[PDB]
Design an enzyme around this catalytic site. Structure first.
Site, PDB file in Angstrom:
ATOM      1  N   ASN A 186      10.494  89.388  52.005  1.00 28.02           N
ATOM      2  CA  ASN A 186      11.992  89.090  51.842  1.00 28.02           C
ATOM      3  C   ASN A 186      12.208  87.831  51.810  1.00 28.02           C
ATOM      4  O   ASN A 186      11.631  87.026  52.598  1.00 28.02           O
ATOM      5  CB  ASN A 186      12.581  89.940  53.047  1.00 28.02           C
ATOM      6  N   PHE A 232      19.448  84.889  56.110  1.00 34.22           N
ATOM      7  CA  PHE A 232      20.424  85.068  57.263  1.00 34.22           C
ATOM      8  C   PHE A 232      21.858  85.556  56.643  1.00 34.22           C
ATOM      9  O   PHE A 232      22.847  84.891  56.697  1.00 34.22           O
ATOM     10  CB  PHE A 232      20.763  83.811  58.196  1.00 34.22           C
ATOM     11  N   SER A 246      12.633  82.089  61.399  1.00 33.13           N
ATOM     12  CA  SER A 246      12.732  82.429  60.187  1.00 33.13           C
ATOM     13  C   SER A 246      12.254  81.502  59.048  1.00 33.13           C
ATOM     14  O   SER A 246      12.370  80.360  59.174  1.00 33.13           O
ATOM     15  CB  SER A 246      14.261  82.767  59.649  1.00 33.13           C
ATOM     16  N   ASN A 271      13.049  81.802  55.937  1.00 31.43           N
ATOM     17  CA  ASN A 271      14.223  81.572  54.636  1.00 31.43           C
ATOM     18  C   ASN A 271      15.421  80.600  54.781  1.00 31.43           C
ATOM     19  O   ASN A 271      16.307  80.757  53.914  1.00 31.43           O
ATOM     20  CB  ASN A 271      14.493  82.999  54.462  1.00 31.43           C
ATOM     21  N   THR A 272      15.533  80.159  55.943  1.00 37.62           N
ATOM     22  CA  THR A 272      16.426  79.061  56.430  1.00 37.62           C
ATOM     23  C   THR A 272      15.701  77.504  56.122  1.00 37.62           C
ATOM     24  O   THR A 272      14.930  77.398  56.914  1.00 37.62           O
ATOM     25  CB  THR A 272      17.256  79.090  57.561  1.00 37.62           C
ATOM     26  N   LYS A 293      11.995  84.078  69.350  1.00 39.09           N
ATOM     27  CA  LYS A 293      11.390  84.806  68.421  1.00 39.09           C
ATOM     28  C   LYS A 293      10.480  83.525  67.852  1.00 39.09           C
ATOM     29  O   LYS A 293      11.189  82.736  67.181  1.00 39.09           O
ATOM     30  CB  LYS A 293      11.945  85.500  67.544  1.00 39.09           C
ATOM     31  N   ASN A 319       7.651  86.870  64.124  1.00 36.43           N
ATOM     32  CA  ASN A 319       8.263  87.136  62.944  1.00 36.43           C
ATOM     33  C   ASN A 319       7.433  87.128  61.805  1.00 36.43           C
ATOM     34  O   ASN A 319       6.068  87.102  61.899  1.00 36.43           O
ATOM     35  CB  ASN A 319       9.251  85.804  62.733  1.00 36.43           C
ATOM     36  N   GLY A 363       4.860  93.887  58.055  1.00 39.01           N
ATOM     37  CA  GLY A 363       4.121  95.148  57.911  1.00 39.01           C
ATOM     38  C   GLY A 363       2.713  95.157  58.227  1.00 39.01           C
ATOM     39  O   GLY A 363       2.257  94.324  58.888  1.00 39.01           O
TER      40      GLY A 363
HETATM   41  C1  LIG Z   1      14.398  92.310  55.337  1.00 38.63           C
HETATM   42  C2  LIG Z   1      14.006  91.859  56.672  1.00 38.63           C
HETATM   43  C3  LIG Z   1      15.059  91.211  57.286  1.00 38.63           C
HETATM   44  C4  LIG Z   1      14.812  90.597  58.433  1.00 38.63           C
HETATM   45  N1  LIG Z   1      15.617  89.878  59.090  1.00 38.63           N
HETATM   46  C5  LIG Z   1      15.335  89.116  60.302  1.00 38.63           C
HETATM   47  C6  LIG Z   1      16.373  88.498  61.052  1.00 38.63           C
HETATM   48  O1  LIG Z   1      17.540  88.481  60.667  1.00 38.63           O
HETATM   49  N2  LIG Z   1      16.047  88.154  62.139  1.00 38.63           N
HETATM   50  C7  LIG Z   1      14.726  88.251  62.844  1.00 38.63           C
HETATM   51  O2  LIG Z   1      14.613  87.688  63.825  1.00 38.63           O
HETATM   52  N3  LIG Z   1      13.660  88.879  62.214  1.00 38.63           N
HETATM   53  C8  LIG Z   1      14.051  89.479  61.040  1.00 38.63           C
HETATM   54  N4  LIG Z   1      13.118  90.028  60.237  1.00 38.63           N
HETATM   55  C9  LIG Z   1      11.821  90.324  60.905  1.00 38.63           C
HETATM   56  C10 LIG Z   1      11.536  91.482  61.661  1.00 38.63           C
HETATM   57  O3  LIG Z   1      12.486  91.279  62.674  1.00 38.63           O
HETATM   58  C11 LIG Z   1      10.316  91.772  62.039  1.00 38.63           C
HETATM   59  O4  LIG Z   1       9.938  90.726  63.075  1.00 38.63           O
HETATM   60  C12 LIG Z   1       9.008  91.521  60.915  1.00 38.63           C
HETATM   61  O5  LIG Z   1       9.391  92.517  59.839  1.00 38.63           O
HETATM   62  C13 LIG Z   1       7.504  91.936  61.493  1.00 38.63           C
HETATM   63  O6  LIG Z   1       7.806  93.268  61.953  1.00 38.63           O
HETATM   64  P1  LIG Z   1       7.078  94.685  61.296  1.00 38.63           P
HETATM   65  O7  LIG Z   1       6.007  94.358  60.404  1.00 38.63           O
HETATM   66  O8  LIG Z   1       7.061  95.862  62.349  1.00 38.63           O
HETATM   67  O9  LIG Z   1       8.484  95.108  60.185  1.00 38.63           O
HETATM   68  C14 LIG Z   1      13.481  90.702  58.919  1.00 38.63           C
HETATM   69  C15 LIG Z   1      12.334  91.449  58.333  1.00 38.63           C
HETATM   70  C16 LIG Z   1      12.564  91.840  56.873  1.00 38.63           C
HETATM   71  C17 LIG Z   1      11.622  92.857  56.188  1.00 38.63           C
HETATM   72  O1  LIG Z   2      17.175  86.776  57.102  1.00 37.83           O
HETATM   73  C1  LIG Z   2      16.189  86.653  56.593  1.00 37.83           C
HETATM   74  O2  LIG Z   2      16.025  86.083  55.534  1.00 37.83           O
HETATM   75  C2  LIG Z   2      14.879  86.632  57.478  1.00 37.83           C
HETATM   76  C3  LIG Z   2      15.244  85.997  59.151  1.00 37.83           C
HETATM   77  C4  LIG Z   2      14.211  86.225  59.864  1.00 37.83           C
HETATM   78  O3  LIG Z   2      14.262  85.888  60.732  1.00 37.83           O
HETATM   79  N1  LIG Z   2      12.923  86.894  59.573  1.00 37.83           N
HETATM   80  C5  LIG Z   2      12.720  86.964  57.733  1.00 37.83           C
HETATM   81  O4  LIG Z   2      11.730  87.426  57.750  1.00 37.83           O
HETATM   82  N2  LIG Z   2      13.934  87.047  57.020  1.00 37.83           N
END
Ligand SMILES: Cc1cc2nc3c(=O)[nH]c(=O)nc-3n(C[C@H](O)[C@H](O)[C@H](O)COP(=O)(O)O)c2cc1C
Ligand SMILES: O=C(O)c1cc(=O)[nH]c(=O)[nH]1
Ligand SMILES: Cc1cc2nc3c(=O)[nH]c(=O)nc-3n(C[C@H](O)[C@H](O)[C@H](O)COP(=O)(O)O)c2cc1C
Ligand SMILES: Cc1nnc2c3sccc3nc(N3Cc4ccccc4[C@@H](C)C3)n12
Ligand SMILES: Cc1nnc2c3sccc3nc(N3Cc4ccccc4[C@@H](C)C3)n12
Ligand SMILES: Cc1nnc2c3sccc3nc(N3Cc4ccccc4[C@@H](C)C3)n12
Ligand SMILES: Cc1nnc2c3sccc3nc(N3Cc4ccccc4[C@@H](C)C3)n12
Ligand SMILES: O=C(O)c1cc(=O)[nH]c(=O)[nH]1
Lengths: 379, 373
Positions: free
Chosen positions: A120, A124, A191, A193-194, A242, A271, A291
């Site tokens: 992804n 934000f 993150s 992506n910023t 985080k 993250n 994942g």
């Molecule tokens: C589409 C997407 C958007 C996410 N947005 C945020 C976010 O805004 N802030 C954040 O701290 N983590 C964000 N994450 C990360 C998740 O909170 C999580 O830490 C990460 O996906 C690893 O966990 P998982 O493998 O169980 O999905 C995002 C992940 C994905 C896939």
């Molecule tokens: O919003 C996002 O692009 C984003 C934020 C974040 O904290 N982690 C992530 O995977 N995507």
């Protein structure tokens, strides 16, 4: 449950529609579709009573069960009630910014079902702190009269707008607006992506950030017929950070020193990663990977940070948690609580029911009287 | 939230989800998504009884109400029960061909919500007559045991495989497989998406085609359908013919003793939809209504009111329907109204038409057929 069959998260129709959307519909649209069901409260709900032996805690933060929804799933906090009733004990809305943000160009979410992975690059996208606060306030007042939700926890993850120079100013605006309604605050310096926001995990910069955020929270008291702490705890929100998994051993030990000195209340590990390059369908795609291919990364990161902080900083686990045995690995590595994201995407509505059940049976099979007996026991 | 609202076609949530899929999800995907709800019987249904004031008939074929689903919506007939229970009195499955075909490249369906129009270029995608027949037989056998569906009509629309030379052989192959389970057969010379098949309604060929279908049908309890009689034979006409071609075709369906005509299929003559600039295919929906309706008045005139009419094209409201009926149609067929109006279309359009017939002084619906005329 014949008439109620449609509200059972394990009703077989939900995975037929899940497998369909995974195969035919853009990922962000499937996400928006999910939130639309939640928004009108026609998501299935979990009727299980949660085992008292599987509750957990971070200081005075009492979770009825050890599973919550990671940040980025209800960024704008538009169906908190509905998502919690899937069986989760908390949700972390956000990440939110002061002013609303479009995000990066679409499409920005891609999936690989065989490997249970997501990439992804949303950047934000969110409605802004003003709007999200109003959404959270409306949940809090529904909580005022709902007994089944009165013990659920809501965190808020805060970050910076894309075109902002010093991140401290943006975190301060969010704490003064939304901090009074959060049970805890997540500072998002992880993150990818910023542009250049993962550089705020340098020991120097992260230290100033944490102290500012704490300063602003403690100043909300001496800064105003109204209850100051309009949340579940009824206390000031705890401060978590985080962390990104793409650090070497030295950065991890330096950050650990800061989180001890600054007296942080927990750390979210972790993250998404940019270090995965063996997913063929993610060849030309950009962003952070979440994942199943992240689980071993995230878990070893837990063991190191549990060791470098002398078990002094509780840990929220995030990364590749799908099964009950995945959860027990995190807990035995040092985590007090876990956070699902990619598990909802690939396993669907049943994810909280299934993993709670699996972990309950696991704890008994391994001889743990309750969940807190297991924390950090692989060490 | 509770089942008594989630199975109501007028429940407001259905418009929220309709509006979402219209703006965000590919048209064919929303169609596939719809069919999935039907397959597992979680579409809403209309339990109300239909007023006998609005029943209609095509010769001995008795419809409990005048509204059905046009061809191309349940091409393969996988949720016939579910779609009928939305409030419709019949559906026309197909168009099916002998051998199954993928059809043309995707995407092949596009929408313009503002003008309530659809363009499509599917090219007769269907599983084939063999697989679709098996689906219809099982509907018939569930119909044998459910009284609530026992008076509903199911037609079959027949066509040719893309790479086929003799059309008579392919239409014959389909009736020998599926004819015993159909209340009527629709011969598809309508479509614009099969190369040069709207040219197979030239008077010379079209006559041989109709006689072929009737001859093969008559050569077949034998009838496991609603009629319990031999299926009636319809023809669906393309609206893009000149005055001379229209009068010629009318002569044939009089000579050949056709039972009805479906007016109309989609048109290629509409070119003022900005969103359809670079797209190809036939246009459906609101901008086709006036076209198809004038086609009805001409065909009702050229056939001296001898051949009943199934209306299709741009029917959304009760007054749209009254125009068709007053123009010569004995029954109406919805497509684009389901796409843009959703689950409520049969419930809403039946109620509107009932009130309209009363406001206009009509003793029943059959008193209105061809009265503008
Ligand atoms: C589409 C997407 C958007 C996410 N947005 C945020 C976010 O805004 N802030 C954040 O701290 N983590 C964000 N994450 C990360 C998740 O909170 C999580 O830490 C990460 O996906 C690893 O966990 P998982 O493998 O169980 O999905 C995002 C992940 C994905 C896939
Ligand atoms: O919003 C996002 O692009 C984003 C934020 C974040 O904290 N982690 C992530 O995977 N995507
Ligand atoms: C996507 C699509 C597929 C169609 N497929 C068929 C078909 O296979 N056979 C047929 O006779 N008509 C087919 N039609 C035409 C409809 O049956 C109907 O005649 C046409 O859409 C005009 O009616 P409307 O204005 O209510 O949409 C199709 C129409 C659409 C939009
Ligand atoms: C599961 C399930 N169980 N009963 C029902 C009923 S009942 C009336 C409508 C209805 N819709 C669904 N879904 C259809 C659908 C379509 C697209 C994406 C997701 C979904 C899921 C959330 C549920 N249902
Ligand atoms: C599918 C899918 N594909 N990407 C995603 C993403 S991305 C962030 C959240 C998210 N949620 C889901 N769903 C989980 C789920 C569960 C049950 C039935 C349908 C669905 C879909 C429609 C939504 N996603
Ligand atoms: C309307 C309505 N009323 N109750 C429900 C329930 S109950 C459990 C699921 C569920 N889904 C829906 N839809 C959600 C949805 C999603 C995507 C595309 C179409 C639709 C419509 C058909 C209905 N529901
Ligand atoms: C939307 C849409 N867009 N194109 C189509 C097409 S194309 C041929 C059939 C067809 N059906 C629909 N639906 C009608 C409807 C009604 C209520 C709730 C959801 C839906 C959608 C999912 C399906 N379509
Ligand atoms: O299946 C198709 O391509 C099709 C058939 C038809 O009869 N009319 C139409 O517009 N499309």
């Amino acid at each position: 449950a014949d008439p109620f069959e449609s509200y059972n998260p394990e009703f077989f129709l939900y995975d037929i529609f899940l497998k369909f959307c995974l195969k035919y519909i853009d990922g962000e649209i499937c996400h928006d579709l999910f939130l639309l069901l939640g928004k009108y409260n026609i998501l299935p709900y979990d009727t299980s009573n949660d085992s008292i032996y599987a509750c957990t805690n971070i200081k005075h933060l009492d979770f009825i069960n050890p599973f919550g929804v990671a940040a980025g799933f209800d960024k704008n906090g538009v169906c908190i009630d509905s998502i919690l009733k899937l069986g989760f004990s908390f949700i972390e809305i956000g990440t939110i910014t002061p002013r609303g943000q479009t995000g990066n160009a679409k499409p920005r979410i891609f999936r690989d079902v065989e490997s249970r992975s997501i990439i992804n690059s949303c950047g934000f996208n969110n409605m802004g702190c003003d709007k999200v606060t109003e959404n959270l306030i409306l949940f809090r007042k529904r909580q005022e009269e709902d007994k089944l939700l009165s013990k659920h926890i809501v965190g808020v993850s805060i970050g910076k707008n894309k075109d902002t120079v010093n991140i401290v100013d943006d975190l301060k605006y969010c704490i003064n607006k939304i901090g009074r309604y959060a049970d805890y605050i997540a500072i998002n310096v992880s993150s990818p992506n910023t542009p250049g926001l993962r550089d705020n995990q340098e020991a120097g910069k992260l230290k100033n950030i944490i102290l500012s955020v704490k300063e602003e929270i403690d100043n909300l008291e001496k800064n105003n017929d109204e209850f100051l702490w309009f949340n579940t705890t009824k206390k000031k929100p705890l401060v978590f950070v985080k962390l990104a998994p793409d650090l070497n051993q030295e950065q991890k030990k330096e950050i650990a020193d800061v989180l001890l000195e600054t007296n942080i209340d927990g750390m979210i590990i972790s993250n998404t990663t940019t270090q995965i390059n063996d997913i063929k369908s993610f060849e030309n795609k950009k962003g952070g990977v979440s994942g199943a291919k992240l689980k071993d990364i995230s878990t070893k990161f837990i063991c190191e940070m549990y060791n470098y902080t002398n078990k002094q900083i509780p840990i929220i686990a995030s990364g590749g948690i799908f099964s009950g045995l995945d959860a027990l690995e995190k807990i035995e590595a040092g985590a007090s609580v876990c956070q699902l994201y990619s598990c909802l995407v690939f396993n669907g509505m049943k994810s909280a029911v299934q993993i709670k059940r699996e972990l309950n049976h696991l704890l008994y099979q391994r001889g743990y009287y309750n969940l807190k007996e297991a924390i950090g026991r692989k060490h």
